[PDB]
Design goal:
Layout (H helix, E strand, L loop, with lengths): L9 H7 L3 E4 L9 E3 L7 E2 L8 E6 L10 E10 L4 H5 L4 H4 L5 E6 L8 E10 L2 E14 L2 E12 L7 H10 L1 E3 L1
Antiparallel strand pairs: 1-5, 2-10, 3-4, 4-5, 5-9, 6-7, 7-8, 8-9
Bound molecules: chloride ion (CL).
């Protein structure tokens, strides 16, 4: 019902619209109340090495050479733009990943805001990962934020870590 764009990742489209992205950090952050469930045995990863990270959680005791994790990134957006238009670029950063294949995609609104979610598999370091990637363009009062959540697992763990990744993906919530 909502048609996706093909040219330009969400970030590049906002750049080209003249918007500035300012990475937020959780301590002190009030504009939004974000729930990111933390499943049993997962913990916050101090010192993640995800640029612009707002919070990174992970299951450090997993099997797999790949540690299952969720990454949340929150940008305050400076400049005017139409969010519903920007959001139609929401799949493109995932669809550029090596060997991307899609399992689920939706551009339905999420908690009342324009949003995209795409889920699927891709290759990285000789390993197949399963991932779920949501962008939310949220409004708090007079500001706009891009909230982005990735939840990734090795494809070999996608069923074993299913209850964790599910509680994260489906418990996720963004409130102004
Ligand atoms: Cl704030």
């Amino acid at each position: 019902p909502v048609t996706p764009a093909i040219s330009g990742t969400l970030r590049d489209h906002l750049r080209e619209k003249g918007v500035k992205l300012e990475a937020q950090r959780p301590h002190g952050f009030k504009a939004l109340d974000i729930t990111l469930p933390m499943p049993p045995r997962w913990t916050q990863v101090p010192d993640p090495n995800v640029p612009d990270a707002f919070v990174v959680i992970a299951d450090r005791l997993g099997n797999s050479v790949y540690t299952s994790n969720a990454q949340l990134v929150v940008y305050r957006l400076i400049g005017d733009f139409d969010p519903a238009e920007a959001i139609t670029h929401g799949y493109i950063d995932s669809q550029k990943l090596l060997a991307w294949q899609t399992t689920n995609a939706s551009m339905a609104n999420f908690d009342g805001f324009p949003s995209s979610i795409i889920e699927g598999t891709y290759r990285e370091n000789d390993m197949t990962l399963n991932t779920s990637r949501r962008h939310v363009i949220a409004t708090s009062g007079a500001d706009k934020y891009l909230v982005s959540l990735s939840v990734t697992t090795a494809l070999s763990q996608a069923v074993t870590d299913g209850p964790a990744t599910d509680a994260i993906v489906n418990g996720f919530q963004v409130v102004a």
